[PDB]
Amino acid sequence: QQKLTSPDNNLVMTFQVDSKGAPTYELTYKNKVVIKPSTLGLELKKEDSKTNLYDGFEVKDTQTATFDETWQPVWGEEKEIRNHYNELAVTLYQPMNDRSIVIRFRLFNDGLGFRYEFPQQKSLNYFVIKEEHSQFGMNGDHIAFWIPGDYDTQEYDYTISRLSEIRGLMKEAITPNSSQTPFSQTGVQTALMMKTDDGLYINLHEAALVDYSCMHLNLDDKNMVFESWLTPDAKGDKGYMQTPCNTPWRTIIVSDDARNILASRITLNLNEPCKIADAASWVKPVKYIGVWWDMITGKGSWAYTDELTSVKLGETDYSKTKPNGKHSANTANVKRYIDFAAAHGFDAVLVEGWNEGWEDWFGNSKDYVFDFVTPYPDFDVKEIHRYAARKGIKMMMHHETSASVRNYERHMDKAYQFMADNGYNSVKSGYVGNIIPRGEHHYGQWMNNHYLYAVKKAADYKIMVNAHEATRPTGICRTYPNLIGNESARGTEYESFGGNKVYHTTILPFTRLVGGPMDYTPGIFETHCNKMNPANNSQVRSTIARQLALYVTMYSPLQMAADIPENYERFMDAFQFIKDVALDWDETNYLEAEPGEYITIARKAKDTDDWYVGCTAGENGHTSKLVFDFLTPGKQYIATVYADAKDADWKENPQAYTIKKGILTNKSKLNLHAANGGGYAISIKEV
Amino acid sequence: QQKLTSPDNNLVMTFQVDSKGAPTYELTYKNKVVIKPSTLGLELKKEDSKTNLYDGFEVKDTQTATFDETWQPVWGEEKEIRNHYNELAVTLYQPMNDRSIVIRFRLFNDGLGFRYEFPQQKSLNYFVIKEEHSQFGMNGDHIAFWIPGDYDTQEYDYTISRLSEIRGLMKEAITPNSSQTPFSQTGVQTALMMKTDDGLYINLHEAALVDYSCMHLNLDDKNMVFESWLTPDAKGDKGYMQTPCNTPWRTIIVSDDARNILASRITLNLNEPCKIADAASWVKPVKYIGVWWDMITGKGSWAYTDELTSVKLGETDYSKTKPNGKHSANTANVKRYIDFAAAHGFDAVLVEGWNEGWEDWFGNSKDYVFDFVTPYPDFDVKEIHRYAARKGIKMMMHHETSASVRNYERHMDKAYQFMADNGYNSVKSGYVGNIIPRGEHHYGQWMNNHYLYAVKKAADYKIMVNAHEATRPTGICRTYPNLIGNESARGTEYESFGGNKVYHTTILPFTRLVGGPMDYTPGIFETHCNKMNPANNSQVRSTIARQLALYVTMYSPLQMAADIPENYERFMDAFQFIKDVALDWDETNYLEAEPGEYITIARKAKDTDDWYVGCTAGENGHTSKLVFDFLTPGKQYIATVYADAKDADWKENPQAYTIKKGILTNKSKLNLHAANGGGYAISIKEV
Ligand SMILES: OC[C@H]1NC[C@H](O)[C@@H](O)[C@@H]1O
Ligand SMILES: OC[C@H]1NC[C@H](O)[C@@H](O)[C@@H]1O
Ligand SMILES: [Ca+2]
Ligand SMILES: [Ca+2]
């Protein structure tokens, strides 16, 4: 039996093979069982004994090591991250197939990562995975914060329930989406967050998802065991491998303090170091607005014309079509956004609907759907470039692919060259619809390769990428820091489609944000969508002060202010917080955190002595007793508090807020109350 | 009921809608039934009554027209082709679905073409084909010359049998291949050739296979009706369509003279005119030798080293590996081939195994299998280029993809740029293995798009393409004349893998060649492969003189002399015919033709007064009584006859030949005998 312990001696992992040679591990934290005895292994597709990569193993060799080094991300929640673990690598020989694998375990003070490694050898070269069988056996019927396991979307509201209740709730939890493939009545996605009856918080996830299919979890709800369930390709297979190769890491992050789940950097720590040598010279955080919410609410259109039943690029002559009078991506309107962005200190303006093809973009399984380079007649690329550059603004490129992936790859070098030629150095991509090639899913090994290919190629052009609908992140930004965002979860757009649950932003930082930032597009001040489009009666489940808080509580180096300029102009005093808030941080302090209920975070803006605080709360609101002892002794600060007014409420009174300005020091304390679906934001600037 | 008749009144096509509103057609030739009443229509994938595009139609309108214009191919069997037909277009309206299609019929003196057309309209825009239901009802249990219906290979020997015998022969007709998907016990490929008891020859095929899935034929052997059977995608669907759009043409070529099947230009006539405006300036025929037969026989290797269990491009350092002593694509060897090519008036030298990756090329479903640009340590790209240039020789590029198609697309512009930068202006591509993306077949709509994308992109680079394993041709060379070849049928390589049937080359011109030329790689003089590789006991099923004949009887603007130079050196007198024979023709006269038995053809070399003749024969040999009245009155010609010796035989005495030189005029006659698996060749040069 092998035993591995954390540097602080609080976690212990024990490993051994059972009497049939099945690799088995368990994990305790402060003498409490976190992972009951659980097996590890894979089943291979038949080309018989060779399909078995799950038992019949003997421990052939073991190697231990300790690692303790600090490194600096290009952008992040703090300036420096420490990577400190004890490691055990176990070489497992399978006599019946004359082949070996290695399982490598890295144990941190805040949890465990493991992966399988497949050395090059005479009897293991090319192989296909039928299923991975990594188990995570739970010690109780925990509370879980989960979304349905699905090969194609993550755009679901979270459910909070016991593990035993998942099966009963799955049908209701799967809401409609134009591309979705659930796989089990007890399947959930990663990162999965849980709260135990004996006071632990446990997060199950993976890190460094490269050259492999995305992992979901399937629950055996009799034994309370989660098991890896990979995403199949068009033929049902779960990964083409060639040695030497490795699986991604699988992680169990655990603490008796929920704040320490947010603090963990295990996911980043398990990714390969930055491979973009000059990254710091060109990768930069971006605060932006955009021509966007018009189309999301239905006020405006992405399409230039309504008169055609379909379009064929390079045949359809848009100069001969009638403008529909709703096309928001027109030069004059874009210039007005550039004006507002420059006036208020934003870095960029996104424009969607700029290019030919939007008439057919949705649900047609169309191959040649966009060319990514040809503008509509009312979008003057060169004039918009020149005007933005003169005003100090960068335009952000939009590459919706409509999930037509061969089409995007064929156009990608020309599309990136077009960006370089026209002053665009960041692009928001998207993959709406069922994947083409047809039969593949959004999160299979094939598409994972695509998303990273797009990122690696972008890096060669010094382009930053934010990909909507892509596989959810697993820390690869460490390796490729030009991946500055994904959506890859249910974002603010769904506040226009019926709403997100009130507690949504009190869960995302414990789940989605583990592995990388989200382009959540916060900042809606007019929360009634019917003021944009009288036919849309959706209401954003937030107060205005909570929207402000999200600039601190939804971490990202890429931050949109998503409302339209005229709405911000109606509340310019509150808007000041969005203008002031930083995007990049030297320190972060998690002040309060309870998943599904509240999150309060203070961050120190990079290369400054200034701090920003946000709190976001769920259905029951939250009372904070803040203590400002993280400020510098002897310094005075000008603090501006943006808070819910008394009786603010996301539903009945969302726009009621107060703003109070005064002096804070490290001796200050403030009592603040977040409303139902409310929150607060504080700027704290050194005098 | 509508009647359409050929210009010469010999053929009549009758069309009507039947009682249930199914469009049906029939065809007669000289008062003999060719096609019995047969239905037309398609079934669509469900998004109920909208799935029906096969009945419930009524005739809304008809238009007739006559077309009679001549055009000139860039390269071909003659200088000018006449396109002369009577047309009927029927507009068919479907009340229950409020939509219309058009079926267009073109009737020539030698057969019928039809296609379906789908106009843009309110109720037919995007749709997916479940099956096409084009019927061809036969009037009898004909003799057919067929290969098994298959979505992935055409590399089968032909079978000659009655239609009623196909079922019982299918199992034995399907021989092993690395990628094959047969679909029916009575499924066959097109072009399908038949001979009827009442003296007709009937060929069933398609033309202009663009943006659509390849058609095979499935035989109802109780009623003798063939029906279109399209190639499914990874999900089983049979084509994504968007109006306005058309199916390919379906063709019935018929005559009571088998020579007239060979003379038909229906397939080319039904393709769109040339879209490469400057094609005449850079597209040109190519006679070549190659570093190739070494590897096909096993004498030499494509791989550089035998040391590695697999390779990772960009990681494996070949300069640190041991040469295997068998790698034929080495500079010195390549220079000896260039020497031979230049000494004997060849245009080009193909080299295979020049680039990194060949250690892994076969059967591994490997994604990143080649980069198409990085040479092995022993292949000096620049020196070979300089040396070839000094000798007036062009190198022919090789792009085997190992069926990894995303990989080839991602590299394609870099690969074509590397060709341009290094003086390569033609490329032989290949698709050996099951297709990646996995789940697709070689002949589905998805891959058909790929092969044409490769050709269209090549045209932008002024590059000519010869693609092995691609979908078999349907006349698209007319539209893109830089498609100078495919294999896409069983070629000479199989003569090294056990042999082709003796009658193979007496069938190919009636089947495979209809739609475009084949890179058959004739010219094997040493027909016992065991002299290349003693472990290889394969024997080419040919005499030497029949190999000479193939330069005339297997038409192609791309002609290999496939043997190694040292073998040609042994038989240099016979090699003279290969040296002399032209590649491109002002006229072709089909002298004798019976499928499966013999084919004799005379052609006039373009821009000359010289003629070349070849005869290829089956198992029984063939006696020819040639009459040279196609020569010019009053001219004398120097004729050289390369013929089988009287005791020649493909098996027992293949290298026995005679060469006779003398004078011919248009009054001359020659009696010649082709041996079993033999033939003869004649050069006829004006004094
Ligand atoms: O690309 C169109 C639309 N697709 C979905 C993306 O999430 C949204 O932000 C974008 O506006
Ligand atoms: O590309 C390797 C090999 N594949 C099959 C092709 O038909 C053959 O000509 C070529 O030599
Ligand atoms: Ca989305
Ligand atoms: Ca081949």
Author numbering:
A (entry chain B), B (entry chain A): 22 to 68, 87 to 726
Which statements did the authors publish about this structure?
BtGH97a was shown to hydrolyze a range of substrate sizes from maltose to maltoheptaose, and both α-1,4 and α-1,6 linkages. The tertiary structure of BtGH97a reveals three domains; an N-terminal β-super-sandwich domain (residues 1–317), followed by a canonical (β/α)8 barrel (residues 318–636) and a C-terminal β sheet domain (residues 637–738). The three-dimensional structure and kinetic analyses of BtGH97a reveal an unusual calcium ion-dependent catalytic center in which a glutamate residue is poised to activate the nucleophilic water molecule with both general acid and calcium ion assistance to leaving group departure.
The structures of BtGH97a in complex with 1 and 2 were determined at 1.7 and 2.0 Å resolution, respectively. Clear 2Fobs − Fcalc electron density in the active site (of both molecules of the asymmetric unit) allowed facile building of the complexes. Each of the inhibitors and the surrounding active-site residues superpose perfectly, so only the interactions for BtGH97a in complex with 1 are described. Hydrogen bonds are formed between the hydroxyl group at C6 and Glu439, between the hydroxyl at C4 and Glu391 and Trp331, and between the hydroxyl at C3 and Lys467. The hydroxyl group at the C2 position interacts with the calcium ion and with His507. The ring nitrogen atom of 1 interacts with a water molecule, which is also within hydrogen bonding distance of Glu439 and Glu508, and hence may mimic the catalytic water molecule in an inverting mechanism (described below in light of 1H NMR experiments). The calcium ion assumes an octahedral coordination, with six ligands, as was observed in the native structure. It coordinates the same four glutamate residues (Glu194, Glu508, Glu526, and Glu532), but instead of interacting with an ethylene glycol molecule, it now coordinates the hydroxyl group at C2 of 1 and a water molecule (all at a distance of between 2.3 and 2.5 Å).
